[PDB]
Design a protein around this ligand. Structure first.
Ligand SMILES: CC[n+]1c(-c2ccccc2)c2cc(N)ccc2c2ccc(N)cc21
Ligand SMILES: CC[n+]1c(-c2ccccc2)c2cc(N)ccc2c2ccc(N)cc21
Lengths: 184, 184
């Protein structure tokens, strides 16, 4: 079973505690010995990187299956992808909380971030077409990403607590994020 | 001293665990019995309301003391007030984390929100003059506030982590927030 068992327990622990979360707690909650966690994942940094790839691949798969390739307007394409992104976060709140904490942790390797980006080429090209050049720079990209993740999580939080207005929060959050991060 | 001790313990606890912070943990960390905490605040909600107003009064005093009335441009003024807001959060990171969790909690009374709203006349009027109608609305103001606090907290987090570019994060964060939340 057990590699999956370790990834799910790391998901919940990091959602709750961020990377400050406990390999003992993780291994325990996965029903295995801690030295066993380290046989599957040689280090904590490798568990963090591997977990991030697994969670991003699930999120990406979920967005890709909803992609209407007929749309070519950058704003309309980005909107329908945001809808999908927020939907996944509403369905998997711990999985999203874990991605956001790992993303901003600066414990992700350059190789990991590029492999994550390559999971959704159309979104990476959308970033290239649409995001302000300052937020695509090496110096401020991480901040751009942090602002995006803040806006997306706040949208998920308001939507999750008031389902009746969820579609409107999702629409208002998209328009706010688009004005915040894109070319004037 | 016991009430102030409970409010400082409550600040630290809610900064770390949100309104899910335990009243057992709060009281112990203040050096008092949970029973005594409920002598000062008969419900968890009354502690939330009182603590919110104490932290907002502190934040508002800090911004009012820094206000430069020589700044007659609405955007530049908003910007100088943003600078003071971020500066207060960098000086008091538990205070700003607690304010954000309390502000989005749905536990604040109508009367609490009204008292908060008229601690800073100049800001209230700038909000009325500048913010998009939808983020003033009874239905979506709370969401607008949540987006603002998410962008402000993210700006503080990046400035605190990478202090060599703090000024740049503060300026970029302001401009992104201004685009996200203000009128044509
Ligand atoms: C900040 C870029 N950005 C954009 C984006 C925003 C505006 C225009 C184009 C792309 C994005 C847009 C949608 N819908 C869904 C996810 C992402 C995304 C996800 C992760 C990340 N690190 C940056 C991301
Ligand atoms: C979202 C409104 N808004 C504005 C604001 C934003 C844009 C234009 C004018 C005012 C604001 C501006 C600065 N500098 C500092 C604090 C706040 C603020 C604080 C709390 C809140 N609940 C809304 C807030």
């Amino acid at each position: 079973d057990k590699k999956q068992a370790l990834l799910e327990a790391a998901t919940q622990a990091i959602a709750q505690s961020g990377i400050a979360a406990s390999t003992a707690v993780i291994a325990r909650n996965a029903g295995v010995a801690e030295g066993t966690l380290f046989r599957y994942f040689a280090t904590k940094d490798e568990l963090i990187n591997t977990l991030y790839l697994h969670l991003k691949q699930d999120l990406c798969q979920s967005m890709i299956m909803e992609l209407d390739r007929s749309i070519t307007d950058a704003k309309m394409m980005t909107r329908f992808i945001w809808n999908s992104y927020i939907s996944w976060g509403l369905n998997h709140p711990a999985r999203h909380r874990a991605i956001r904490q790992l993303a901003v942790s600066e414990k992700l390797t350059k190789e990991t971030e590029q492999r994550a980006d390559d999971m959704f080429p159309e979104l990476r090209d959308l970033c290239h077409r649409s995001v302000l050049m300052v937020f695509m720079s090496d110096e401020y990209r991480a901040f751009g990403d942090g602002l995006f993740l803040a806006l997306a999580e706040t949208t998920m939080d308001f939507a999750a607590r008031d389902p009746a207005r969820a579609g409107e929060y999702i629409a208002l959050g998209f328009e706010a994020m688009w004005r915040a991060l894109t070319r004037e």
